[PDB]
Amino acid sequence: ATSQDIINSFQSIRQEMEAYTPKLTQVLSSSAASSTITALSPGGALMQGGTQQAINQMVPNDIQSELKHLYVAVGELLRHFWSCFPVNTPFLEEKVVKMKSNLERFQVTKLCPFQEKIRRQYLSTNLVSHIEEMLQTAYNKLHTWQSRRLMKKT
Amino acid sequence: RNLQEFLGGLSPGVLDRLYGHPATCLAVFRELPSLAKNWVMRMLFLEQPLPQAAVALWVKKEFSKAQEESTGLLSGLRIWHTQLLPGGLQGLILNPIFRQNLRIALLGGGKAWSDDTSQLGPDKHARDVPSLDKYAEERWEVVLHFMVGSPSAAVSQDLAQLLSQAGLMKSTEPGEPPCITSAGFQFLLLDTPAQLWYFMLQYLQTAQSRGMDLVEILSFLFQLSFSTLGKDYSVEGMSDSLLNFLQHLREFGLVFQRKRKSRRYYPTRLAINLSSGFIVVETNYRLYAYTESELQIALIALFSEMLYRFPNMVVAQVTRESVQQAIASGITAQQIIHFLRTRAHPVMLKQTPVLPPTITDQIRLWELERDRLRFTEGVLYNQFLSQVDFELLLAHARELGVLVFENSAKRLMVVTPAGHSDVKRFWKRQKHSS
C-alpha cells in the first residue's frame, strides 16, 4: 500500500507489544461506561426506538392512496422505459425521448403539488425522496446511454 | 435448603462482612440467576445509580416475571441497594464493597487468598489425587456407617452429638448407641453434595453454640470451594477457632492433612463440590450397579430386593413390596427417583429422559398406594333440627379453624377433638341465650 512507513509501523507495534503488561483500571472508566449505557439505552444512537413510530397513523390514508397511485404510475412508466431499453433500433430512440418527456410532465403535474402538500403538512417522512431516486437514476441512465451513443459517432 | 435461603435470613451486617472476601463475592455471584449475572456485569463499572425504570426496560415485557424475581433476589441478598436519586427517582447501584471485591477477584489486586505455598518448599509426605479421593471416600463411608451404627465405624463424640442435634439419630437412653430416625434414612438417600451442604448448613446454624464466627467460617469455606485440587495451602494465618473447624473438616474428609500440627492441607474433590454413575436401570424393574462398597449396596437394598452380588456388580429387582417397605420406613418416592437419576450410568444418559418414564410412573403409583385411605380423628355433629342453626355453628367452627369436613345438604360437620369442647360450650351458650 504505502512506502516503507508500513514496515516502520510494523516495527513500532512489535517494539510496543514486546513489553506488554495487562491493565485493570485502564481498561474502562465510569464516564465511558455511562456514555455507552446512554448510547445503548432505548432512544439512543444505536437503540433508536422511533423508526417511523406511528407511520401507520402518520401521513393519513388519504395521502397514502395518492402515494400508491403515484407509485403505480411511476412503476408503469419506468417499466415501459426499461422495456424500451436497450435501444438497438432507431425507432426506439424517439420512444425513449417521448417516455422521458412523459415522465417529466407527470413529475411536474403530480410530485410538485405533492411536495407542496407535504411541506404544508410538514410530514416527517421523505416519501418524495425515494420516488426522486428512481427518476434520477432513470435520467442518469438515459444521459449515459446518450453519451455512449455520441461516443460511437465520434 | 440452599445457600440463597440461608443468606436471605442473615442480618445486613453479616452480609456486609461476608462481602469483604473476594472469594465470597464470586460464590454469591455464581449462585445468581442467569439474568442477574448480566445485570451485575453491566453495572460492574458504574459509579452512579441507574433509574429503576431504565433497568426494567432492558428486559422485554413477556419476561417481566423473571426480571422481578431476579430483582427481588438481588434486593434480598443486598448485592445492590436502592439509592434516593435526586428528583424523586430511585437509583440502583451495586454495593461498593461487593463491587470492589468482585473486581479484585476478577481483574486482580491485593494479596493472594492464601498466604504462601513455597515457603516450606515441597511436601516431604505429599500424596496423589487418587489417594486423596480414596481418603475422602473412606471418611465419608465411615461417617455414613456410623449413621447406621455398625461397630466398624468409630468417630468423635462431638460428631455424634452434632448428628443428634441434626435430628438424624436420637439417644433414648444414655450410654447405649443412638438409633437412626426416618430423617436419617431420608438424609442417607440424599445425594452426597446435597448431604455435604445440609451438614454444613446445620454446622453454621449451630456454630453460635460453640462461639465461632459465622463470617470467617463462610469465607474460609468459599475459599476452599475455589481451591485447586491437588494443591496445598498454608494453615497459618487463621484464628484458633478456625483451626477447630479445619480439624472437623479433616474428620469429615473434605480436607486432607497428615498431622494436626502440620502447616499444609490438601483440599479434596468433595471440598470443591461443596460450592454446588454406576446404576443401570432396565424397563423390567432391574438395577445393575457397578459398585463394591457396602454403602451403595445398603442404599440400593433399602428400596429394592437384591438378587445377585458379583464381585464388581450388583443385580437387584425393584418390586412393589420392597418399595412399599422403604416408603413405610419414611423414604418418599421423589427421593428414590432423584437418587436413581443421580447415580445413573453414563450409558443411560443417551436416553431422553435418562430414567424410563414407566419405571418412575410405577414407583409414584406404588407410593400413592400406602396413603389411599385418609384418617382424621374428630367429632361429628348430626343433630341439627334447623338449617339456620347448622349454618351458625359451622361459621363459628370455621372461625375457630377446627372444621375438618362439612356437608350443608345433610347438615353434617366434623370438628377436631381439640376444638370439640369449644364448639360444645358455644352450642350450650347459644341454647341458653335463646
Swiss-Prot record, chain A:
Quote the subcellular location field of this record.
Answer: Nucleus
On modification after translation, the UniProt record reads: (Microbial infection) Upon Rift valley fever virus infection, interacts with NSs leading to ubiquitination by the NSs-FBXO3 E3 ligase and proteasome-dependent degradation.
The job of this chain, per UniProt, is described as: Component of the general transcription and DNA repair factor IIH (TFIIH) core complex, which is involved in general and transcription-coupled nucleotide excision repair (NER) of damaged DNA and, when complexed to CAK, in RNA transcription by RNA polymerase II. In NER, TFIIH acts by opening DNA around the lesion to allow the excision of the damaged oligonucleotide and its replacement by a new DNA fragment. In transcription, TFIIH has an essential role in transcription initiation.
Taxonomic lineage from the root: Eukaryota, Metazoa, Chordata, Craniata, Vertebrata
Organism field: Homo sapiens
Q: Which family does it belong to?
A: Belongs to the TFB1 family.
Q: Where does the chain cross the membrane?
A: none
Name under which the protein is recorded: General transcription factor IIH subunit 1
Query: Quaternary state and partners of this protein?
Result: Component of the 7-subunit TFIIH core complex composed of XPB/ERCC3, XPD/ERCC2, GTF2H1, GTF2H2, GTF2H3, GTF2H4 and GTF2H5, which is active in NER. The core complex associates with the 3-subunit CDK-activating kinase (CAK) module composed of CCNH/cyclin H, CDK7 and MNAT1 to form the 10-subunit holoenzyme (holo-TFIIH) active in transcription. Interacts with PUF60.
Swiss-Prot record, chain B:
Q: Could you tell me the superkingdom of the organism this chain comes from? A: Eukaryota
Q: Cellular component terms, GO, for this chain's entry?
A: core TFIIH complex portion of holo TFIIH complex; nuclear speck; nucleoplasm; nucleus; transcription factor TFIID complex; transcription factor TFIIH core complex; transcription factor TFIIH holo complex
A single Gene Ontology molecular function, please?
A: double-stranded DNA binding
> Is Oxidoreductase there in the keyword field?
no
Q: Specify one Pfam family.
A: Tfb2
The record ties this protein, via InterPro entries, to: Tfb2_C (IPR040662), TFIIH_p52/Tfb2 (IPR004598)
Which keywords does this chain's UniProt record carry? DNA damage, DNA repair, Nucleus, Transcription, Transcription regulation
Q: Name one GO biological process term.
A: transcription by RNA polymerase II
Similarity field? Belongs to the TFB2 family.
Q: How does it assemble?
A: Component of the 7-subunit TFIIH core complex composed of XPB/ERCC3, XPD/ERCC2, GTF2H1, GTF2H2, GTF2H3, GTF2H4 and GTF2H5, which is active in NER. The core complex associates with the 3-subunit CDK-activating kinase (CAK) module composed of CCNH/cyclin H, CDK7 and MNAT1 to form the 10-subunit holoenzyme (holo-TFIIH) active in transcription.
- This chain belongs to the protein called General transcription factor IIH subunit 4
